[PDB]
Amino acid sequence: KFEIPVCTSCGREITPREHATHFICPNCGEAVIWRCESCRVLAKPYKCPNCGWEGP
C-alpha cells in the first residue's frame, strides 16, 4: 500500500496520466504543493499549509 498524491487546492485525488504537477513551496521550502490538471487550467489559488501564503 503506497500513498497517492492529493491536490492541495481542491483536495481531490490525482489520476495516473493527467497533466498534474508538484513542487516545493516557493515561500517556506519544506512543504510540497500538488496541483491537479483541472486546478491548473482553471487558475485556482493555492495556500501553503505551513506559510499560509496564497498564490497560483
Added chain:
Amino acid sequence: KPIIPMPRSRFLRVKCIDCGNEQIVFSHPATKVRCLICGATLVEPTGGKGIVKAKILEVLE
C-alpha cells in the same frame, strides 16, 4: 451577484434655504419634494438620483 442586496440610495437630512426648516427626504425621489412650511422645492426628480436644491446636513444610512 450580491448575496444580500443593499440599496444604493440614502435618506438625507437637509436644511431648507428659504425658511431653514429641517427635513428628511429620499435621495431618489419619484416626485417633486416640497418644504412642509414654505412650500419651496427641495429635490428635482430625474431618471435616477435627484438634484438637491437645499443644504445637505446629514446622510443617514
Added chain:
Amino acid sequence: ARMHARKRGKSGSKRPPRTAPPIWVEYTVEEIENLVVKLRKEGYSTAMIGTILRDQYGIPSVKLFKDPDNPNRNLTITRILEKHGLAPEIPEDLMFLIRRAVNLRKHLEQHPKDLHSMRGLQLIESKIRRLVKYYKRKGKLPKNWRYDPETAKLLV
C-alpha cells in the same frame, strides 16, 4: 420573465434587511396613520401615498411598524385605510387595468384598423381575467362578478 413580452428586466426595489423601524424616523405610528388618511383624502392611490411618504416625509415604509391593534401583523397602507373605512371598493390594480382597457376600447372604436392596439387590449383583458379569478378564489368580490366591457364603463 415578463408575463407576455418574455423579457427579463430586473429593475426594482432593494430594501435592507430590517426588523424594527430606524431610530431617525421623526413621526410616530399615530402621526403616520394620520398622514396616510390625509393623503387618501387628498385623493392619491396606495402606491402614490407610499411614494409621497417615502419622498417628502422621510418614512422608509409603514410595513416596518407593528400594528398596535394586532400584535400578530405589521401595519400597511391598505390596512390603515380599511381601519379608517377608506379602502378601495375593489382592488386598485384591477381598477387601473379596467380603466385603461376602457380607454383602449374607446380609441379602437375610432381606429378599427389598429390591430396592434387590439392585441394590447387582448393582453390587458387577459390580465384582468386573471386578477378576477384570483380575487374570486380569495373571496374579495362577489362570486357572480364577471367582467363585461359594457358594464366596465359604469365602474370607470
Added chain:
Amino acid sequence: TLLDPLANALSHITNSERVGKREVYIKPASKLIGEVLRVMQKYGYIGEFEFIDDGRAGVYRVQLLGRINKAGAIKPRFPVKVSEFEKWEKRFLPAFEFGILIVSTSQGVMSHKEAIEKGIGGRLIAYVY
C-alpha cells in the same frame, strides 16, 4: 418559475463541485434544505454551513470539501417501505452502501441506512454520493 429549491440547491452544489469551488451560496433557504445539509455534513460530504438572514426566505453558505461525486434530488418523491430499499440503491448508487439516499420519514429526514436501522420507511427526497 422556481419549482423545487432543494433540486436547485443540489444541482448548484454538483455544478460548483465539478469546477472545484470552495464555497457555495444556496438561495432561497428552507428547512428541508437545512436538514439535508445537516445529514450531508453528518456523513462528511460537505463542510461547515450557516444560515444568513436577508429579509427573505434566507440564504445558506456552504463549504465544499471536494468529496461529492454527484448529488441530486429524487422526483417524483417515491414512497418506499423498509423492505423496498435494495432496488432504489441499485438504481441510484454505484455500489452497496456507497452513497446516501436522503429520505423524509415520519420521524424527520435521515439517511436510508438510518431508516433501515430504525425499521421505518418514507419518501425518497434526494441522493448523494
Added chain:
Amino acid sequence: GDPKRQRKKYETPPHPWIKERLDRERVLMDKYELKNKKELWKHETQLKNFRRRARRLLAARGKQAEIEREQLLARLKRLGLLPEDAVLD
C-alpha cells in the same frame, strides 16, 4: 391460463460455435468421459442454480432467508462439495 409443462433441467449455450467454449468443453468431455454435451450442460446448470441461490441469499434479510442459508450450506456439505467449516462466501 395453462397447465403445468415439465421444463428442461439443462440449458443450451447462448452461441453454438465459440472457439473458447468448444475447446474447454472438449477438454472436459475427453477427461471425464461424458456421452453427450447435455450431461455437461446439466452439471453446469446445477452449479449455476447453486450460485444463484447463494447470490440471492447473500443480499436477503429475514428468518426464511437465514433458514435457507443454513439449509443450502448443509446440503452442499452433505453433497461433499464444501468443507465442514465453509461459509456462504
Added chain:
Amino acid sequence: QEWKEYAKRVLDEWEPKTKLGMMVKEGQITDIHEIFRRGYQIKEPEIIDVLLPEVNARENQEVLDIALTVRMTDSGRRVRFRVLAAVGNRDGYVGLGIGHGKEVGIAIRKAINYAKLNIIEIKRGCGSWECRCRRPHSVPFAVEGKEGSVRVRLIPGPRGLGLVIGDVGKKILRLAGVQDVWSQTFGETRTTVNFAKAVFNALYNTNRVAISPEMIERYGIVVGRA
C-alpha cells in the same frame, strides 16, 4: 525469472534518453507505481520493459483489430494497415495503442509500442450486492467511459461470473486483471476502435471517483499490483 532477467538485460544494454529514463537507469525509481500521478512523460518502451517485464509475453499481448484503409491518388490505390492492440499484466496495469504501417507486422509492432507507452494504472475490488466479498476480482464500483459515440458502463459482478461484455472489452479487462463484471453499452459497438477506447476510458475512470478511508476496507480496493 525469465522476465526478471529480461529486465536486467534491457537495463544493461539500454541507453536512456529522457528524464524518466535517466531516473529509472540510475535507480531513483524502483517500482512502477512511482512513475504515475507525477506528470512525467513516458516516451521510451524500455521503461515499461524494465518495470513491467511480463508485458512482453504473448499471453499478455493481445491484438484487437486489423483494418485496411485506402488513399486515392491519380495513379490508384494506396493501401495502409491500421492495427489496434492492447498489452499489460493481469494485475492492475493495462495499456492500449494504435499503429499504422505498410505491412501488418510493422503495424503490430508500432501498436504494441504505443500501447506500452500509453499503459495506465487502475483500481479493482468488489462492490456488488450479491458478492459483498473483499477481493480484487472485479471493479470496486460502477464506472462510465465514452469515446466518440460509444458509451460503456461497467458494473461490479458476483465472484465467478464471467465477463458479461463484448469480446473487445472482455479481452481488455482480462489483460487488466478484472475477472467478473456486468456491462451496459450504447452506440455503435461494432466500431472496434471506439469500443476499445471506451472500455479503456471506463477502466481509467476508476481513479476519478472520490472514496472514503473506510471504503477501501469495505470494497477491498487494490491499486495496481495486488
Added chain:
Amino acid sequence: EYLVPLDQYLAAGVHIGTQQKTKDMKKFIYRVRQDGLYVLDVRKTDERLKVAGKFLAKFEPQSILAVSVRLYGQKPVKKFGEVTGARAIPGRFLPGTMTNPAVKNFFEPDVLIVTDPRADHQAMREAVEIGIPIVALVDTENLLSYVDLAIPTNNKGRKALALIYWILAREILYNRGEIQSREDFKIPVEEFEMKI
C-alpha cells in the same frame, strides 16, 4: 520597495500594463488611469520577485530554462542565462525540443520561465505536457492558466524586462549564496537592456 527604489521601478516603467484587463489579474491591478490604461502594483511585483528568486535558488542552475520570443526580451534572457547558469532560448522555440527526443537540442528542464504566456504559447504547452513548474512574467491582459508562479510586470517594455531580469538574477545569486550580499553584484543594469 526593497530590492530597488520605487523611483527606479517607475523610471523603468514596470507598472505600465496594457489597455485590456483580466479577472485573473484583477488582484494585481493597482488602478486604471483616465485614458483607459491599467497600472500594476509595484509592491506585489517586489514580493513576487522575492518569492520567485527564493524558489529558483533551490533548483540546480543547469536545469532552469528561460524562454522569450520577443525581440526586446531576447537579450535580458540571454544575460540571465549566462549569469545564473540557466539555459536560455531567445527567439523561436523549435517545437519538439522538450517532447521529441530525436531533436538535436532535446532538453528536459526542471523549471521553466516564460517572458510572456501569449508569445510563449508553444513553450508553455511543452512545459504542461512535460509536467514541470512554470514561472511567467504576466501582464494585465495575460491569463494565469497553467501558470504556477506569476510575476506581475510589464513584459513588453525593454527597460522593464531588463530591470526585471537583472533583479531576478541578483535575487537567485543572493539566495544561492554565490554572493555574500546584494551589493556584491557588479554587473550594471544597462547591459541587460537591448541595444536600439
Added chain:
RNA sequence: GAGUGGUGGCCACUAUUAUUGGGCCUAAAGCGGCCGUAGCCGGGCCCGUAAGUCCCUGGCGAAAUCCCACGGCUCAACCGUGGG
C-alpha cells in the same frame, strides 16, 4: 446426436416504444406566431386534521402450479411432510 433440419407465430435481440430508459440546428421529428379552458407542475415561515405515506396488529386473497430441506418410488422426473 435418437435426434437433426425446413416453414409460420410469441419474447429477447430492440435504449427500434424509452416510468426505470430514446430523440426533434444540419440525418424522422418544435405547431408560422401568440393569448388562454380543463389537466399536470407549482415561493418562505407558524399552527390544526391524518386523506395520501410509513410502522405494528386482527379477517382475508381455495387447491394445483413456483422455491427450499427431508423422506418414498434405484437417484431423477413424479409423489408425501414442513417452511416460504
Added chain:
RNA sequence: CCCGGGUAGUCCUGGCUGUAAAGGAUGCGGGCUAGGUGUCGGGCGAGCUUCGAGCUCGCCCGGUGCCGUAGGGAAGCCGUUAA
C-alpha cells in the same frame, strides 16, 4: 434564356383565402457552470469641455454580435443569447 410591346396584378376602400427555406431548419418559464472584446438604452463615479441633450474612461442592469476555457457532439460547430 436576350430584345420591342403588353392584359391580370402590383396601389386605395370593405371582406374572403390562412399558405412560405413563415429558417436561429433550435418551443416556452426557473436556478447553476472561466474569461475577453465591439455596439444600443438607462443609471452611477471620475476627467475634460467650445458648458452642448457635448467628448473620454470605469462599474451595474437589460438587448444585440464576434472570439474563447471547462464541458457537449458523429462531426460541422455550440459554449451565461448552450446545442
